[PDB]
Design a protein around this nucleic acid. Sequence first.
DNA 1: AACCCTA
Length: 73
Amino acid sequence: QTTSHELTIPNDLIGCIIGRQGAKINEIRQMSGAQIKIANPVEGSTDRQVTITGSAASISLAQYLINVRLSSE
DNA sequence: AACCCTA
Ligand SMILES: Nc1ccnc(=O)[nH]1
């Protein structure tokens, strides 16, 4: 199985997901095995597009890990 | 109050 899930995260919350030097998001990539793409900043947008791609288990785990981070902030 | 990776 290989599909993509799309979400949108406000600009002020994406730093918590990424972490300093991208350490947090890199960890989420490594643990989940999912391909994760956070869009470049868009000056006329309040949020960032995030795409999670991979197996059903990988996408689910990536989403779980993202929610853990969001639930702190 | 807001970490900037991968690609
Ligand atoms: N208020 C919100 C917090 C986290 N994620 C959202 O999409 N919205």
